[PDB]
Design a protein around this ligand. Structure first.
Ligand code: HEM
Ligand SMILES: C[C@@H]1C[C@H](N(C)C)[C@@H](O)[C@H](OC2CCCCCCCCCCCC2)O1
Length: 396
């Protein structure tokens, strides 16, 4: 079977990838494709097989197992738990697990509520009663929360944001490299700036751990840890909030049901993850040996992407999959992954999204989508399902 070119689609494919994936899934679990940016990878589609591959230790996350070359700017940032296997994965994650439990995250609630209250205050001063929800709330909220956790000073954040866009959503390869190089230079200086300042933010704590014992946390791993916690804080929750509010505003009967009973809110947020989560495909996996998936054999070291999005539209697992239904049974969705790499930030992402959504509904009378769905534009990245903008309006 020939390599399918996703780039050739466009677009189209970036707005609505689902039929493309579902067509693949009818033929079987694994497919050689060429991403819009030009990388040859495997797609794993279909819920059951997606779930198994996510947790299967025959599929490594360590780039030493991959046959794909890394540039210097890329390699400098890959000593992090998401790009590791046990035992390194185990050791790195244990260093921060305690910061991200539900009970520790619950203590951030007053401060997350305050950040939301202020962003919405400012949004609602708009004289025309219109805004882009992404500029006004979905982007600044997660950024502010994770910046204050890690200790990124406020004046540094705007630059920081440009980099983390420039290489999550490139448009030009040399720019992505430059940004990675700069982000890495910045994080090193930030890290150095904490030494001997007795700060109590998370990065100051990790700096002390590393300086007390460089075999528990190396300086490369310390930079990798600040990087992964910050980027994940920049680019996932944003899209959960935007995509989810889009789902609600474009399914007016679900929005009303939720208005009528706000106790449905937690279950509505799960169905946002299930129906249109920010993660369209999981991060790279590399088979340590060749892996046979129903007669399709995947060679050692090839790149494998597990397609979360298609898993979530598998009718056998989620009946009536294309329906956004806030009361659906969402248990078992893969929006936060599955297995040893299951999202460490999930309690924090849920806290943010629940608060932001409830603030929008309670505070925006007759909240409306301010363009038709057909006018929205989706970024092309096949790992991310994300809008460029979400125009909303409300009654002023
Ligand atoms: C709605 C928001 C989020 C979604 C949908 C999400 C999704 C995911 C997924 C699918 C994975 C597993 C990747 C894989 O196995 O290939 C993951 C891992 C990870 N996420 Fe989240 N994420 C979100 C928010 C966050 C936040 C706010 C943080 C910051 C604390 C975070 C930090 C991480 C880290 C460090 C990992 C690697 C965990 C490991 O390897 O053990 N994520 N995320
Ligand atoms: C480690 C990988 C490398 C990749 N490129 C440099 C090739 C980058 O775009 C990706 O991160 C994106 C993709 C979203 C996946 C969601 C998982 C959330 C965990 C944090 C990873 C960064 C998130 C953004 O992180």
């Amino acid at each position: 079977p020939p390599v399918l070119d996703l780039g050739a689609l466009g677009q189209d494919f970036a707005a609505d990838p689902y039929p493309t994936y579902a067509r693949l899934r009818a033929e079987g679990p694994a497919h050689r494709v060429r991403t819009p940016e030009g990388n040859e990878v495997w797609l794993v589609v279909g819920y059951d097989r997606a779930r198994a591959v996510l947790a299967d230790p025959r599929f490594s996350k360590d780039w030493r197992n991959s046959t794909t070359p890394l540039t210097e700017a890329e390699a400098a940032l890959n000593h992090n738990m998401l790009e590791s296997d046990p035992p390194r994965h185990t050791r790195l994650r244990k260093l921060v697990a305690r910061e991200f439990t539900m009970r520790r995250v619950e203590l951030l609630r007053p401060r997350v509520q305050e950040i939301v209250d202020g962003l919405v205050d400012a949004m609602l001063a708009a004289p025309d009663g219109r805004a882009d929800l992404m500029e006004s709330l979905a982007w600044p909220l997660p950024i502010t929360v994770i910046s204050e956790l890690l200790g990124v000073p406020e004046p540094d954040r705007a630059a920081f944001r440009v980099w983390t866009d420039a290489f999550v959503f490139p448009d030009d390869p040399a720019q992505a490299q430059t940004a990675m190089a700069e982000m890495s230079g910045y994080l090193s200086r930030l890290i150095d700036s904490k030494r001997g300042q007795d700060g109590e933010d998370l990065l100051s704590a990790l700096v002390r751990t590393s300086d007390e014992d460089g075999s528990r946390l190396t300086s490369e791993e310390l930079l990798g840890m600040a990087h992964i916690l910050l980027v994940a804080g920049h680019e996932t929750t944003v899209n959960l909030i935007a995509n989810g509010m889009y789902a609600l505003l474009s399914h007016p009967d679900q929005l009303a049901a939720l208005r009528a009973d706000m106790t449905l809110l937690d279950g509505a947020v799960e169905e946002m993850l299930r129906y249109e989560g920010p993660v369209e495909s999981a991060t790279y996996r590399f088979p340590v040996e060749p892996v046979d998936l129903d007669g399709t054999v995947i060679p050692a070291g090839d790149t494998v992407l597990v397609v979360l999005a298609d898993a979530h539209r598998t009718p056998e697992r989620f009946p009536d999959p294309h329906r956004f239904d806030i009361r659906r049974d969402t248990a078992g969705h893969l929006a936060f992954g599955h297995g040893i790499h299951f999202c460490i930030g999930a309690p924090l992402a849920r806290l943010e999204a629940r608060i932001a959504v409830r603030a929008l509904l309670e505070r925006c009378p007759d909240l409306a989508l301010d363009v038709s769905p057909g006018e929205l534009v989706w970024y092309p990245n096949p790992m991310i399902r994300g809008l460029k903008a979400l125009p909303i309006r409300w009654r002023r």
